[PDB]
Amino acid sequence: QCKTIAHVLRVNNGQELHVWETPPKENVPFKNNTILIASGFARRMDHFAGLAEYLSTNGFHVFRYDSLHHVEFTMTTGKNSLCTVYHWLQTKGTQNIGLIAASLSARVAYEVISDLELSFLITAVGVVNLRDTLEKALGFDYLSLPIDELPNDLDFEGHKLGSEVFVRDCFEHHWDTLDSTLDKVANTSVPLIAFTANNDDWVKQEEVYDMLAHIRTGHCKLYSLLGSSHDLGENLVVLRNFYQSVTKAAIAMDGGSLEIDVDFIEPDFEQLTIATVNERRLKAEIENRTPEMA
Amino acid sequence: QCKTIAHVLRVNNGQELHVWETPPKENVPFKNNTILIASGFARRMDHFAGLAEYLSTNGFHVFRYDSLHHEFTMTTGKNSLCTVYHWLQTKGTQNIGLIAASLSARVAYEVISDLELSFLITAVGVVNLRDTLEKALGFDYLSLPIDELPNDLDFEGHKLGSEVFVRDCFEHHWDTLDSTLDKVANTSVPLIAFTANNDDWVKQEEVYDMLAHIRTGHCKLYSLLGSSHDLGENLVVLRNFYQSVTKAAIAMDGGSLEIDVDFIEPDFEQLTIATVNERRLKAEIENRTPEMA
């Protein structure tokens, strides 16, 4: 299989998380930052297997990770998965790390950017206002209901969510408002490029600009993905416009720049097909792997 | 003892609640409405023993109830009021007025579009729970993650266990002014809201804002003489409290909202005896047959 490695990280409470590692290609120029990709809610995106391809063909050592589980999700479990993989890279010796995150995973990333030592953060259609996005996505503001009148589960695809556990954590760990985001983002030093989709009914672009406007370093940029809505896997043109945008941003930011009109090597359909089928091989591999304690 | 009867209601889940009943004085004109008084948080107010005195000396049959228990959450407050109301209903009592003050008045505004009450009178009643608690406790604790909260919060004499209380505020939407404004909006119950002239804890502008969302328009705001939020600051502030609410209960029992009404005022010996009767009631509640409710 192209040498992508399956890792099982076993966090001390009986929780497990899977990490998919893809090494850089043999003779491309050196890339200083290791890339972390939050690939938990990315079922419909084949867990970003093709983005890891686009990045290793361009020189990056990639780690993709999913969510902690106990053999349902709250935003705090997403935050703990990212902090677990991150401390494991640090102890394997990795020092320079960039992070890419999209949609709901981007809210989890904005939450720790004033606490984590990251070389950069890139987000795509990232949610800044959880309550408003979940309203737009589900057709109703379920967070306005008494907790005990909640439907048993909600379907926010990427996955499905147990309503009470998840809504209780929103309020208790204050994930819910645009202000909780702006408070977090405010004192960061991490460079950030934010891609918004053009026809995105779920993430208000003005709210993204407002969040960028609170980053007191003024060291950020917003760019837009053409003719896309929130669904980045809508068709193959919207998908590769995401892949190429995020790869030029990873290359620019790896070199301290925020201007993304940069050159890159693009995988062809055959390489991308091999990466898709090679994911099924990895899923079977991870069936029997030694957990690594964390 | 003066005639107050104690009762212990046990609800179907093993929580008890205490109700103190004072019948009207014998030869005074009939009063159509029984009065319920939320008295759980009124330790410093001697659990409203003298307001009951004032009221029964004027013909009202009064019930005062505490909070359900086997710490407190606002929903426990709402279930305690709903339990006693439902219990009085089973006794065939039909016309029921309610008096609530401070924290308890928020509980009262939560259910006033669901209960058939003849009227509601509130004193220094909180319309915006998050803002009052910031003012009372010095800091907005509701802005912290639940796991960084202190063990207890000391609110107005009573200690509040912080995790269970803050979880319930968000979960049952007790926290904002808007939640109050939604519950109050379609009410048919007449309301007199008394505010204190220099209350730091409750903003008068927000009480007027609440009253202004009551579509029927039959409500009135009157203000108490001095008072800060503390109705038991001194004997003058306290008697202005007792006196204002007695005129409002008299006037509203006859469908009026203007309180320049005559009333009978207990003297000091009658209020003292009510205070001592409270010790007597508190002791014998343990040798009282629980009533199912």
XYZ file of C-alpha atoms in Angstrom:
587
model
C 0.000 0.000 0.000
C 1.467 3.561 -0.413
C 3.132 3.767 3.051
C 0.358 5.335 5.098
C 0.512 3.989 8.653
C -2.465 3.188 10.923
C -1.943 4.169 14.602
C -4.241 3.403 17.481
C -3.774 5.902 20.318
C -5.182 4.742 23.599
C -5.856 7.621 25.991
C -5.746 6.563 29.672
C -9.642 6.385 30.306
C -10.458 3.529 27.932
C -10.737 5.715 24.845
C -9.239 5.053 21.488
C -8.483 7.317 18.507
C -7.180 6.363 15.076
C -4.373 8.278 13.266
C -3.528 7.853 9.600
C 0.056 8.902 8.800
C 1.216 9.686 5.165
C 4.974 10.329 4.612
C 6.288 12.952 2.091
C 7.128 11.715 -1.446
C 10.665 10.639 -2.140
C 12.094 13.564 -4.123
C 10.101 16.698 -3.567
C 11.642 19.642 -1.674
C 11.695 19.767 2.122
C 8.696 20.983 4.054
C 9.342 22.257 7.537
C 5.849 21.722 9.065
C 4.177 18.406 9.823
C 0.412 18.719 8.962
C -2.454 17.610 11.269
C -5.901 17.204 9.585
C -9.020 16.807 11.645
C -10.749 14.062 9.657
C -13.458 13.019 12.155
C -16.637 14.316 10.455
C -15.368 13.578 6.963
C -17.201 10.363 5.967
C -18.594 12.032 2.844
C -15.063 13.242 2.015
C -13.455 9.801 2.380
C -11.735 11.164 5.521
C -9.724 13.533 3.455
C -7.604 10.670 1.900
C -7.175 12.722 -1.296
C -6.072 15.877 0.545
C -3.344 13.854 2.303
C -2.300 12.799 -1.253
C -2.179 16.307 -2.545
C -0.052 17.313 0.446
C 2.497 14.425 0.474
C 2.949 14.720 -3.301
C 3.950 18.283 -2.370
C 6.430 17.399 0.434
C 4.349 17.285 3.647
C 4.315 14.559 6.238
C 0.593 14.292 7.093
C -1.273 12.895 10.086
C -5.101 12.694 9.820
C -7.012 11.772 13.045
C -10.596 10.968 14.001
C -12.438 11.234 17.462
C -11.906 9.604 20.828
C -14.480 6.751 21.368
C -14.767 4.002 24.065
C -13.687 0.659 22.544
C -21.647 9.938 21.340
C -19.669 13.029 20.367
C -19.683 16.317 22.134
C -17.598 19.293 20.948
C -15.420 18.705 23.994
C -14.477 15.161 22.827
C -13.337 16.734 19.497
C -11.165 19.189 21.460
C -9.710 16.382 23.544
C -8.886 14.272 20.415
C -6.957 17.207 18.905
C -5.087 17.854 22.218
C -4.316 14.055 22.464
C -2.812 13.712 18.898
C -0.999 17.011 19.374
C 0.730 15.956 22.584
C 1.612 12.598 21.007
C 3.329 14.373 18.069
C 5.247 16.494 20.539
C 6.564 13.476 22.375
C 7.467 11.668 19.158
C 9.674 14.765 18.837
C 7.598 16.784 16.332
C 8.044 20.455 16.781
C 6.568 22.438 13.901
C 2.882 21.619 13.285
C 0.255 23.226 11.046
C -3.438 22.244 11.388
C -6.186 22.119 8.697
C -9.809 21.814 9.834
C -13.185 22.181 8.200
C -16.740 22.815 9.166
C -17.535 21.742 12.827
C -13.907 20.738 13.403
C -12.848 24.275 12.653
C -14.860 25.461 15.803
C -12.894 23.001 17.889
C -9.622 24.384 16.341
C -10.561 28.110 16.993
C -11.128 27.042 20.574
C -7.559 26.129 21.274
C -5.576 28.512 19.030
C -4.678 30.778 21.881
C -3.441 27.783 23.872
C -1.667 25.708 21.149
C 1.765 26.117 19.701
C 0.937 25.782 16.019
C 2.800 27.225 13.034
C -0.498 27.959 11.274
C -4.105 27.081 11.007
C -6.059 26.758 7.746
C -9.868 26.384 7.912
C -12.504 25.751 5.292
C -16.214 26.788 5.765
C -15.461 26.822 9.491
C -18.267 27.372 11.941
C -17.895 30.426 14.114
C -21.427 30.460 15.581
C -22.482 26.939 16.532
C -26.104 27.696 17.537
C -26.867 29.569 14.298
C -25.175 26.936 12.039
C -27.007 24.046 13.777
C -30.242 25.927 13.359
C -29.547 26.355 9.592
C -28.500 22.801 9.221
C -31.358 21.155 11.189
C -34.140 23.559 10.287
C -34.896 24.347 13.960
C -33.051 25.929 16.903
C -33.056 22.874 19.141
C -30.870 24.682 21.665
C -33.966 26.840 22.509
C -35.823 23.780 23.868
C -35.750 22.494 27.473
C -33.170 19.719 27.482
C -35.852 17.198 28.347
C -37.994 18.007 25.251
C -35.113 17.154 22.938
C -35.537 14.516 20.168
C -33.326 11.489 20.919
C -30.733 12.279 18.219
C -29.927 14.911 15.633
C -28.523 14.198 12.125
C -25.735 16.705 11.356
C -24.088 14.906 8.571
C -20.748 14.148 8.840
C -22.218 11.853 11.611
C -25.406 11.604 13.881
C -25.514 13.176 17.403
C -27.107 12.136 20.739
C -29.104 15.312 21.534
C -28.859 15.577 25.328
C -25.121 14.767 25.765
C -24.194 17.132 22.991
C -26.534 20.032 23.927
C -25.591 19.736 27.627
C -21.885 20.117 26.681
C -22.620 23.142 24.443
C -23.970 25.103 27.375
C -21.659 23.787 30.075
C -18.507 24.379 28.075
C -19.888 27.475 26.324
C -19.508 26.342 22.638
C -22.693 27.866 21.550
C -22.269 31.557 20.725
C -20.306 33.705 18.330
C -18.782 35.390 21.469
C -17.249 32.203 22.788
C -15.342 32.027 19.502
C -14.310 35.654 19.411
C -13.007 35.384 23.029
C -10.834 32.480 22.073
C -9.484 33.785 18.842
C -8.654 37.277 20.199
C -5.206 36.781 21.716
C -3.806 34.336 19.146
C -0.450 34.505 17.426
C -1.071 31.524 15.046
C -1.277 32.746 11.368
C -4.758 31.722 9.948
C -6.193 31.503 6.433
C -10.008 31.158 6.396
C -11.706 29.906 3.228
C -15.456 30.602 3.104
C -17.727 29.039 0.416
C -19.423 31.410 -1.870
C -23.121 30.229 -1.485
C -22.722 28.983 2.126
C -26.189 29.127 3.773
C -24.863 27.729 7.037
C -21.913 29.940 7.992
C -22.594 33.685 7.754
C -19.570 35.319 6.025
C -19.977 38.497 7.993
C -19.537 36.441 11.171
C -16.268 35.055 9.772
C -15.007 38.551 8.965
C -16.025 39.644 12.504
C -13.979 36.789 13.986
C -10.977 37.618 11.783
C -11.405 41.255 12.893
C -10.896 40.174 16.532
C -7.592 38.605 15.996
C -5.580 41.370 17.455
C -2.384 40.390 15.523
C -4.120 41.238 12.157
C -2.161 38.245 10.831
C -4.888 36.376 9.006
C -6.517 36.257 5.583
C -9.940 35.235 4.266
C -10.300 33.715 0.757
C -13.406 32.275 -0.931
C -14.093 28.974 -2.630
C -15.929 29.651 -5.857
C -19.479 28.498 -6.538
C -19.516 26.143 -3.556
C -22.109 25.860 -0.836
C -21.139 24.259 2.591
C -20.824 20.870 0.852
C -17.287 20.583 -0.379
C -18.000 17.149 -1.894
C -20.946 18.369 -3.947
C -19.185 17.460 -7.238
C -15.575 16.909 -8.474
C -14.993 20.502 -9.418
C -15.966 21.872 -5.990
C -13.858 19.106 -4.414
C -10.617 19.806 -6.312
C -11.084 23.545 -5.932
C -10.980 22.773 -2.133
C -7.976 20.493 -2.497
C -5.940 22.860 -4.582
C -6.817 25.942 -2.432
C -5.876 24.337 0.819
C -2.618 22.954 -0.743
C -1.436 26.295 -2.024
C -2.228 27.775 1.419
C -0.265 25.010 3.158
C 2.699 25.695 0.874
C 2.553 29.476 1.250
C 2.147 29.377 5.019
C 4.903 26.785 5.391
C 7.163 29.520 4.115
C 5.724 32.359 6.245
C 3.540 33.812 3.462
C -0.218 34.327 3.362
C -0.357 34.959 -0.442
C -1.425 31.651 -2.016
C -0.694 32.135 -5.718
C 1.986 29.545 -5.430
C 2.969 26.462 -7.458
C 2.033 22.960 -6.588
C 2.085 19.451 -7.955
C -1.443 18.033 -8.483
C -2.213 14.213 -8.157
C -3.927 12.661 -11.152
C -7.055 10.500 -10.944
C -5.039 7.303 -10.753
C -3.092 8.446 -7.644
C -6.310 9.628 -6.074
C -7.996 6.258 -6.842
C -5.116 4.389 -5.216
C -5.415 6.595 -2.091
C -9.250 5.849 -1.961
C -8.787 2.061 -2.207
C -5.782 2.066 0.041
C -8.124 3.496 2.763
C -10.087 0.257 2.746
C -6.844 -1.684 3.247
C -5.940 0.636 6.222
C -9.350 0.104 7.891
C -8.686 -3.650 7.927
C -5.092 -3.101 9.179
C -6.235 -1.052 12.145
C -8.525 -4.028 13.054
C -5.432 -5.477 14.769
C -2.854 -2.898 15.734
C -1.104 -2.357 19.026
C -2.530 0.746 20.779
C 0.048 3.351 21.671
C -0.597 4.833 25.060
C -1.478 8.463 25.342
C -50.151 28.611 69.760
C -52.006 30.912 67.320
C -54.081 28.816 64.826
C -51.438 28.066 62.117
C -51.509 24.410 61.012
C -48.362 22.687 59.647
C -48.613 20.053 56.778
C -45.963 17.873 55.144
C -46.718 16.987 51.480
C -44.755 14.056 50.185
C -44.703 13.824 46.435
C -44.623 10.436 44.600
C -40.747 10.420 44.443
C -39.969 10.726 48.154
C -39.429 14.476 48.279
C -41.126 16.358 51.052
C -42.284 20.023 51.193
C -43.681 21.944 54.191
C -46.845 24.107 54.060
C -47.918 26.451 56.913
C -51.581 27.387 56.958
C -53.100 30.439 58.712
C -56.954 30.693 58.658
C -58.610 34.202 58.483
C -59.591 36.111 61.561
C -63.070 35.452 62.688
C -65.058 38.627 62.422
C -63.632 40.341 59.411
C -65.281 40.569 55.921
C -65.011 37.592 53.596
C -62.169 37.328 51.167
C -62.739 35.379 48.021
C -59.133 34.291 47.316
C -56.911 31.933 49.290
C -53.301 33.296 49.198
C -50.157 31.236 48.510
C -46.797 32.852 49.568
C -43.532 31.376 48.273
C -41.560 31.439 51.515
C -38.636 29.020 50.953
C -35.982 31.693 50.529
C -37.257 33.933 53.306
C -35.147 32.966 56.352
C -34.121 36.512 56.945
C -37.784 37.512 56.569
C -38.785 35.012 59.270
C -40.348 32.935 56.456
C -43.011 35.545 56.065
C -44.752 34.818 59.419
C -45.742 38.471 59.890
C -47.080 38.954 56.336
C -49.379 36.017 56.978
C -50.388 37.823 60.213
C -51.150 41.000 58.346
C -53.106 39.110 55.726
C -55.231 36.817 57.928
C -55.969 39.755 60.270
C -57.644 41.138 57.118
C -59.642 38.053 56.179
C -57.293 36.012 53.952
C -56.721 32.262 54.336
C -53.010 31.889 53.764
C -50.697 29.070 52.822
C -46.931 29.465 52.834
C -44.793 26.666 51.345
C -41.082 25.915 51.304
C -39.161 23.913 48.616
C -39.298 20.233 47.763
C -36.357 18.252 49.193
C -35.547 14.708 50.309
C -29.208 21.357 46.323
C -31.968 23.771 45.087
C -32.373 24.527 41.441
C -34.953 26.966 39.913
C -36.874 23.986 38.500
C -37.146 22.566 42.031
C -38.713 25.910 42.871
C -41.241 25.572 39.996
C -42.152 22.028 40.976
C -42.749 23.033 44.575
C -45.247 25.754 43.514
C -46.952 23.392 41.021
C -47.190 20.722 43.798
C -48.935 23.004 46.346
C -51.235 24.587 43.740
C -52.295 21.135 42.575
C -52.775 20.003 46.234
C -55.038 23.002 47.064
C -57.000 22.207 43.918
C -57.684 18.701 45.171
C -59.020 20.307 48.374
C -61.477 22.079 46.091
C -59.928 25.477 46.542
C -60.566 27.392 43.441
C -59.591 31.036 43.619
C -55.909 31.449 44.425
C -53.711 34.543 44.484
C -49.864 34.267 44.748
C -47.289 36.575 46.372
C -43.600 36.052 45.509
C -40.478 38.128 46.170
C -36.919 38.261 44.780
C -35.719 34.874 43.311
C -39.166 33.283 43.908
C -40.850 35.870 41.734
C -38.834 34.488 38.699
C -40.315 31.045 39.392
C -43.787 32.754 39.487
C -43.235 34.454 36.111
C -42.235 31.081 34.644
C -45.644 29.509 35.226
C -48.061 32.454 34.976
C -49.198 31.599 31.510
C -49.967 27.968 32.635
C -51.722 28.424 36.029
C -55.214 29.851 36.597
C -54.291 32.271 39.386
C -56.627 35.204 40.302
C -53.616 37.515 40.616
C -49.936 37.788 41.204
C -48.205 40.319 43.442
C -44.379 40.362 43.348
C -41.877 42.392 45.370
C -38.278 43.061 44.144
C -38.810 40.157 41.685
C -36.031 39.079 39.439
C -36.727 39.342 35.706
C -33.103 38.701 34.500
C -31.460 35.884 36.505
C -27.952 36.167 35.000
C -27.665 39.884 35.732
C -29.015 39.682 39.322
C -26.601 36.865 40.190
C -23.624 38.828 38.790
C -24.723 41.787 40.971
C -25.352 39.743 44.047
C -22.279 37.476 43.856
C -19.853 40.046 42.394
C -18.935 38.034 39.266
C -20.817 36.438 36.353
C -20.297 32.783 37.297
C -22.491 31.577 34.416
C -19.621 32.552 32.033
C -17.259 29.917 33.480
C -16.999 26.276 32.318
C -19.047 24.148 34.687
C -15.894 22.442 35.879
C -14.251 25.633 37.046
C -17.216 26.623 39.322
C -16.745 26.955 43.091
C -18.522 24.416 45.336
C -21.263 26.719 46.499
C -22.496 30.191 45.836
C -23.977 32.060 48.868
C -27.132 33.841 47.612
C -29.093 36.049 50.004
C -28.286 34.013 53.071
C -28.819 30.562 51.482
C -25.909 28.599 50.008
C -26.572 27.277 46.431
C -24.693 24.161 45.199
C -23.107 25.671 41.994
C -22.882 22.828 39.391
C -26.503 21.612 39.746
C -27.817 25.175 39.903
C -25.870 26.496 36.859
C -26.604 23.277 34.776
C -30.354 23.757 35.426
C -30.320 27.505 34.430
C -29.114 26.823 30.904
C -30.899 23.491 30.468
C -34.302 24.903 31.453
C -33.645 28.406 30.090
C -33.925 30.282 33.382
C -31.078 32.658 32.627
C -31.996 35.543 30.340
C -34.497 38.374 30.437
C -36.055 37.040 27.181
C -37.031 33.725 28.694
C -39.019 35.703 31.300
C -40.507 37.910 28.532
C -41.726 34.815 26.649
C -43.466 33.277 29.645
C -45.155 36.437 30.746
C -46.377 37.620 27.297
C -49.721 35.799 26.878
C -50.733 35.949 30.493
C -54.263 36.619 31.609
C -53.344 36.842 35.362
C -53.433 40.450 36.780
C -50.060 41.510 38.188
C -48.772 44.162 40.574
C -45.023 44.355 40.582
C -43.496 46.345 43.532
C -39.938 47.527 42.887
C -37.531 49.041 45.474
C -36.414 52.568 44.898
C -32.577 51.791 44.885
C -32.329 48.138 44.085
C -28.953 47.347 42.576
C -29.761 43.727 41.944
C -32.847 44.072 39.688
C -32.977 46.846 37.081
C -36.251 48.773 37.076
C -35.952 49.408 33.368
C -36.088 45.603 32.804
C -39.146 45.167 35.071
C -40.959 47.871 33.081
C -39.738 46.069 29.974
C -41.337 42.870 31.229
C -44.641 44.521 32.158
C -44.714 46.122 28.744
C -44.765 42.666 27.080
C -47.902 41.578 28.813
C -50.405 41.840 26.048
C -53.544 42.217 28.260
C -52.082 45.379 29.819
C -53.578 44.675 33.288
C -50.568 45.116 35.424
C -49.256 47.927 37.594
C -45.780 48.733 38.946
C -45.694 50.593 42.299
C -42.436 51.274 44.188
C -41.504 50.586 47.802
C -40.386 53.529 49.940
C -36.714 53.094 50.358
C -35.388 49.696 50.373
C -32.501 48.475 48.469
C -33.182 44.802 47.546
C -33.381 44.057 51.263
C -36.937 44.219 52.513
C -35.834 43.379 56.094
C -33.195 46.070 56.346
C -34.978 47.794 59.214
C -38.463 47.751 60.751
C -39.718 50.710 58.605
C -38.729 49.179 55.220
C -40.249 45.891 56.437
C -43.590 47.390 57.498
C -43.832 49.341 54.247
C -43.405 45.936 52.580
C -46.089 44.248 54.732
C -48.412 47.148 54.334
C -48.014 47.589 50.546
C -48.670 43.955 49.718
C -51.742 43.782 52.069
C -53.338 46.721 50.342
C -52.540 45.142 46.910
C -54.021 41.741 47.995
C -57.151 43.509 49.316
C -57.633 45.628 46.207
C -57.004 42.664 43.765
C -59.335 40.315 45.617
C -62.046 42.749 44.420
C -60.684 43.123 40.842
C -58.968 46.439 41.435
C -55.361 47.417 40.773
C -55.355 50.787 42.695
C -54.187 50.160 46.240
C -55.521 53.119 48.284
C -57.640 50.781 50.263
C -58.162 50.516 54.020
C -56.653 47.723 56.014
C -56.256 46.438 59.588
C -52.626 46.552 60.817
C -51.316 44.090 63.488
C -49.577 45.710 66.413
C -46.234 44.614 67.851
C -47.595 42.001 70.333
C -49.480 40.163 67.554
C -46.367 40.111 65.239
C -44.163 38.884 68.203
C -46.540 36.026 68.924
C -46.436 34.977 65.243
C -42.566 34.881 65.507
C -42.693 32.638 68.601
C -45.429 30.439 66.998
C -42.945 29.757 64.228
C -40.687 27.922 66.745
C -43.665 25.826 67.854
C -44.617 24.933 64.248
C -41.057 23.981 63.308
C -40.753 21.464 66.125
C -44.010 19.613 65.556
C -43.624 19.235 61.793
C -41.757 15.966 62.596
C -44.824 14.457 64.189
C -47.105 15.266 61.326
C -48.663 12.702 58.999
C -47.380 13.423 55.441
C -50.099 14.184 52.881
C -49.642 12.785 49.368
C -49.455 15.490 46.677
